[PDB]
Amino acid sequence: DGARRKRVLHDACVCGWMIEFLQAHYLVEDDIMDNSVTRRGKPCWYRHPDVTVQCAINDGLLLKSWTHMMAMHFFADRPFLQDLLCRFNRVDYTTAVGQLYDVTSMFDSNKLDPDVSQPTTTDFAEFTLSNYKRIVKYKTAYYTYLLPLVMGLIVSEALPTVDMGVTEELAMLMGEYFQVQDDVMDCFTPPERLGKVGTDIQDAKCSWLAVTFLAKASSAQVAEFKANYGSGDSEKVATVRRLYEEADLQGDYVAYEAAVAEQVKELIEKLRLCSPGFAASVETLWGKTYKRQK
């Protein structure tokens, strides 16, 4: 009965694609929303010569639908189908909510009314580590780190066998870090290694660099920041890059990374106690994240 082994392995593969197809749907839409140019070495889907912006928005939705179509096909007769889809839609919605947070992080939330125009915030009062942790918790951690673990547990019919409280803590922790890494690469990793041209400075995003810079910078540094942040101009984007370098954020990063790595280390041990096999595959996922070059 290497048939259980075949069925689980195949279902895991399908679930793997569901997420990848979910990721794909998000990147197509994120790129339009972020005004990105390039992705995985090539142009963003909406920037392909024969693809119109309107058709790209719709292509993004097709992608999302395919996740449901593939699940319904392959898992039609499976007792976990209803549980799988519940979770998968929860995470997806939570990811969409996270994107609300990201996409509105540059407006003063008190002046956030549909009926009335507003520009980018000039005092950046919301650019706090608190608000940052929220953005990232919902826009990345859930779909990137918690969902793949849970989907693996579901097709293995082993979901109840792990400490979910701890698993959730792990997923939240590694997910934040992965995002902080995304934000640092978006600024200091060259586009050709990365596959994409960074748009966080230009887009006046609440990136980790922004929020950490602002919590330690003098007022001279902050003023020069507020003059140069959220502009397409390359001399301006080049200053912000300098202001980060000058504030030694590479130091805050190493420290943050170390703190994440030891807390991650502890939680995996709490998880190894009753659930040693899950603990291993979590360690691998960590292994694919920690100090990733990408």
Partner: protein, 63 residues
């Protein structure tokens, strides 16, 4: 191995979706080819960490 089967199932899924499209949504081969390039361009080319993690968790646990 994990990757090799993962792409195997990619080609199944892709087959099912594109054919279902042809057979039940009255889709011409032109649009069908459009969607194949779109699907490969948007789903393929990353490091597949989220997908591969699922298979990984599943292999580790079946024991």
């Amino acid at each position: 191995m994990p990757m090799q089967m993962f792409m195997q199932v990619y080609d199944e899924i892709q087959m099912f979706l594109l054919e279902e499209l042809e057979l039940k949504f009255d889709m011409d081969p032109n649009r069908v080819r459009y969607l194949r390039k779109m699907m490969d361009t948007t789903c393929l080319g990353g490091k597949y960490n989220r997908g591969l993690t699922v298979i990984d968790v599943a292999e580790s646990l079946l024991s």
